[PDB]
Structure formats: C-alpha cells, structure tokens
Amino acid sequence: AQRVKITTTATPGEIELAFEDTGTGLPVLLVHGFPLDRTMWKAQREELCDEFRVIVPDLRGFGESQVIPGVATMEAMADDLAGLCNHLGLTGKIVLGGLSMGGYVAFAFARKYRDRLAGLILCDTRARPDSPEAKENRRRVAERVRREGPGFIAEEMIPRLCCESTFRNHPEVIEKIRQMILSAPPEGVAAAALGMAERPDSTDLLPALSCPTLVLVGQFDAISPPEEMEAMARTIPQSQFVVIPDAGHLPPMEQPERVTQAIREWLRKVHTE
Ligand SMILES: [Cl-]
Numbered sequence: 150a151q152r153v154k155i156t157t158t159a160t161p162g163e164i165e166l167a168f169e170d171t172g173t174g175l176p177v178l179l180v181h182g183f184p185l186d187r188t189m190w191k192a193q194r195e196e197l198c199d200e201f202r203v204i205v206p207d208l209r210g211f212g213e214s215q216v217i218p219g220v221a222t223m224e225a226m227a228d229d230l231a232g233l234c235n236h237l238g239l240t241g242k243i244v245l246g247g248l249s250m251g252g253y254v255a256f257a258f259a260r261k262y263r264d265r266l267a268g269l270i271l272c273d274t275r276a277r278p279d280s281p282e283a284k285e286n287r288r289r290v291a292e293r294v295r296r297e298g299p300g301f302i303a304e305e306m307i308p309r310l311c312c313e314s315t316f317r318n319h320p321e322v323i324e325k326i327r328q329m330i331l332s333a334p335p336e337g338v339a340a341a342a343l344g345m346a347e348r349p350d351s352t353d354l355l356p357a358l359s360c361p362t363l364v365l366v367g368q369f370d371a372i373s374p375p376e377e378m379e380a381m382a383r384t385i386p387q388s389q390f391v392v393i394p395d396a397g398h399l400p401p402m403e404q405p406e407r408v409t410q411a412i413r414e415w416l417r418k419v420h421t422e
Contacts, residue, residue, distance in 0.1 A: 150167055150168065150169050150187075150213070151167070151168055151169070151170060152165060152166070152167045152168075152213060152214075153165065153166060153168075153233075153236055155229065155232040155233050155235070155236045156232050156235070156236070157225070157228045157229045157231070157232040158228045158231070158232070159222075159224065159225035159226075159228035159229060160217070160225065161217060164209055164214070164215050164217060164229055164232075165214060165215040166206050166207065166209070166214045166215070166229065166233055167187070167206065167207045167212055167213035167214045168187065168204060168205060168206035168207065168233065169187055169194055169203075169204070169205045169206075170202070170203075170204050170205075170237070171194050171195065171198040171202070171203050171205075172197065172198030172199065172200070172201050172202040172203050173202050174200065174201055174202050174422075175201055175202065175244070175267075175416075175420045175421070175422065176201070176202045176204060176234075176239050176243045176244070177197065177201045177202065177203050177204070177243070177244045177246065177412075177416065177420070178203075178204045178205070178206070178230060178233075178234070178243050178244070178245050178246070179193060179194065179203065179204070179205045179246045179247070179251075179270075180206070180208065180226075180230070180245070180246065180247035180248070180250075180251030180252075180254050180255060181205075181207075181208065181211070181212075181247075181248060181250075181251050182247075182248045182249035182250050182251050182273070182398075182399070183249060183250035183338075183341055183342075183345070184211065184299055184302060184329075184330055184333040184337075184338045184341065185211070185326070185329045185330070185333070186207050186211050186212030186213075186329050186332070186333070187205040187206060187207045187212055188212075188325070188329060189248070189326070189329065189399065189401055189402055190203075190205045190401055191205075192401065192402075192405035192406075192408075192409060193401055193405065193408060193409050193412060196405075196409045196413075197409060197412065197413060197416075200413065200416075200417075201416060201420070204233070204234075204237070204239075206229075206230070206233060208221075208226050208229070208251075208254070208341070209221050209225065209226060209229055209337070209340075210334055210336065210337020210338070210340050210341055211333060211334065211337050211341070212333075214337075216334045216336050216337045216340070217340060218336045218339075218340055219340055219343075220340055220343040220344050220347065221337070221340035221341045221343070221344040222257075222344040222347060222348070223250075223253045223254050223256070223257035223344055223345070223348045224257045224260075224261065225344070226254045226257065226341075226344070227254055227255075227257035227258035227260075227261055227262065228261070230245070230254070230258055231258070231261075231262050231265065234265070241265070242264075242265055242266060242267040243265060243266065243267060244266075244267050244268040244269070244270065244416065244419065244420050245258055245259075245266060245268075245269055245270070246269070246270030246271075246272065246363075246412070247270070247271065247272065247274065248272040248273050248274065248399070248401060249272070249273050249274050249372070249373070249398065250274075250341065250345060251272075251274070252271045252272065252273070252274025252275070253274065253345060253348055253351075255269055255270075255271060255274075256276060256351040256354060257348070259354060259358060259360075260351070260354055263359060266359070266360040267360060267361075267419065267420050268360050268361045268362065268363070268415075268416075268419045268420060269358065269360055269361075269362040269363070270362075270363045270365065270412060270415075271362060271363070271364050271365070271381075272364075272365040272366070272400065272401070272408075273365070273366055273367060273370050273372065273373045273378070273398045273399070273400065274373055274378075275373050275377065275378075275381060276350070276351035276352050276354065276355055276381055276384075277350055277351070277352055278348055278349060278350045278351075279345065279346055279348070283346075284346040284347075287342040287343060287345055287346035288342070288343065288346060290302065290338075290339075290342045291338070291339035291340075291342040291343050292339070294335050294338045294339050294342070295335050295336060295339050296335075298331075298335050299330050299331060299333050299335065299338055300331060302330055302333075302338070303327050303330040303331055306330065307323065307326065307327060307330075309371045309372055309397075309398065310326060310371075310372070310397060310398045310399055311323060311326070311396075311397040311398065311399055311402075311403055312367065312368075312369035312395060312396055312397035312403065313369070314369075314395045314403075315395075315396070315397065315403045319403065322402050322403060325402065326399065326402060352384075355381065355384040355385045356384055356385070356386065358385055358386060358387075360387070361387045361388075361389075361415075361418075361419045362382075362385045362387060362388045362389070363388075363389050363391065363411070363412070363415045364378055364379075364381065364382040364385065364388055364389065364390045364391070365390075365391045365393060365400060365408065365411060365412075366378040366379075366390075366391075366392055366393065366400070367392075367393050367396030367397045367398060367399070367400045367403065367404075368392050368393060368394045368395060368396060369395070369396065369397045370396070370397050370398045370400075371397055371398060372397075372398045373398065375392050378390070389415060391411045393407050393408060393411070394407070
C-alpha cells in the first residue's frame with residue numbers, strides 16, 4: 150500500500166490518504182462503507198487487477214488515512230477522491246464504486262465531478278438523506294464514539310451487516326468485519342457520522358446521471374433492502390440491477406466471488422480502452 154499527501158479542494162486543503170493501487174489499465178476506484186476501511190474490497194482488488202487498475206483508499210478518518218476532526222462531509226470525501234486521482238495522473242474518466250456510505254460519497258462525486266465518470270457502481274446504499282431521527286442518531290453515535298470508541302457500534306451493527314449464512318459458513322469474515330469496526334479511529338468515525346447526517350438528498354440526482362450504473366445488493370440486506378434498491382435502480386438511466394444471493398449488507402465480503410464476477414462482466418461492457 151501507499152500513503153500520500155494529496156491536494157484536495159475540501160478543507161483543510163491537504164490530506165494524507167492511505168490506499169491500494171493494483172493492476173493496470175482502466176481505473177476502477179472502490180470506496181468502503183462506514184465504519185470500515187479499504188480492506189473490505191480486498192477480494193475484488195486482488196482479483197480484478199488482472200484486467201483493470203483497482204484503486205482502494207481509506208477515506209479521511211478511516212483505516213490508515215489522516216483523521217480530520219469536525220465534520221467529514223460526503224462532498225469533502227469526494228473532493229479527496231478527485232485529489233487522489235489528480236495525484237495519480239488519473240485526470241480523465243474513472244469507474245467509481247461505493248458501498249453504503251461509500252455510495253453516499255459516490256453520489257457526492259457524481260454531483261460535482263460528472264465529467265470524470267465512465268460509470269458508477271452503487272452497492273447496498275440509498276440516495277435519500279437521513280430522516281430526522283437518523284440524523285439525531287448520527288449525532289448520538291458521534292458524541293459517544295469520541296469517548297467510548299467503536300465497540301458499541303460493532304455490537305449494534307454486526308447483526309444487521311451480514312446474513313445468517315455468513316455467520317454459519319464464514320465466521321472468519323464476521324471477525325474481519327468486527328476488527329475493521331473496532332480499529333476505526335474514534336474521531337474519524339465521529340466526523341463521518343456528522344457528515345452523513347448533513348448529506349443532501351440525492352434522489353433527483355439519479356435521473357440526471359450521465360454514465361452507466363451497476364446497482365448491487367445482497368439478497369438479505371437488512372439495511373438497504375433489495376426492494377428499495379431495485380426501486381432506486383429504476384430511477385437511474387442505463388442501469389443494471391443485480392441481487393447477490395446469500396449476502397446481507399456486505400456482499401463484497403460475504404460473497405466475494407459473486408461480487409467480483411458481477412463487477413467484472415459489467416466493467417467489460419462499460420469501461421473500454
Ligand atoms: Cl451524498
């Protein structure tokens with residue numbers, strides 16, 4: 150992996166990002182969820198790199214990236230991605246994928262950097278903003294995690310993140326996810342929780358998208374359910390919708406080969422030299 154200070158148009162103008170960059174050819178940037186890190190895309194990065202260049206950063210405040218206290222807006226995270234692409238000399242078009250919060254970041258990127266997208270991959274996410282109670286729950290999480298760390302988040306989220314079959318067949322995946330959460334920097338978690346609370350409604354952005362979009366969801370996703378994601382996909386032009394069997398909210402980890410294949414075959418259609 151690499152760690153580089155990038156220039157970003159978001160406050161504070163420069164930030165150190167840790168990232169993986171594996172493969173050659175057409176660039177695919179994959180954005181993790183909350184409160185995870187780049188390692189949740191490891192299987193896809195290690196497999197797709199035979200055909201694509203796969204870039205997987207830790208977002209600001211997560212993993213090994215710099216922590217910027219306060220509020221980490223989805224826009225700021227998108228600005229950081231643009232700055233990373235600039236650093237790397239990826240100044241033309243990319244495919245951008247995101248899971249959950251990473252999907253929120255992808256919408257912020259599409260809003261601001263439309264001309265840099267060859268395609269979007271939206272996994273286990275939604276375009277609407279937080280409801281008022283959800284916003285308040287962000288704030289409650291932020292205030293507590295600063296002091297207690299993320300153990301209480303792992304306790305609340307793990308049962309909602311993966312399906313029954315994953316608990317049975319893949320306890321090692323459960324434990325990897327748990328360690329991602331437990332290791333997340335407390336102030337990075339807080340800043341992103343507050344940022345998510347203030348993200349805009351992206352509902353009306355979706356019909357205005359100008360690139361092919363793959364929408365992926367676990368069959369048993371308890372957080373962003375398949376019915377809801379299918380309806381979201383119906384609002385996006387040039388969309389393809391895929392349900393991954395025997396996965397919950399984290400298909401890339403729960404059913405890595407299925408996710409890799411779905412992404413690979415779509416990329417072959419979209420992302421050409
Ligand atoms: Cl957003």
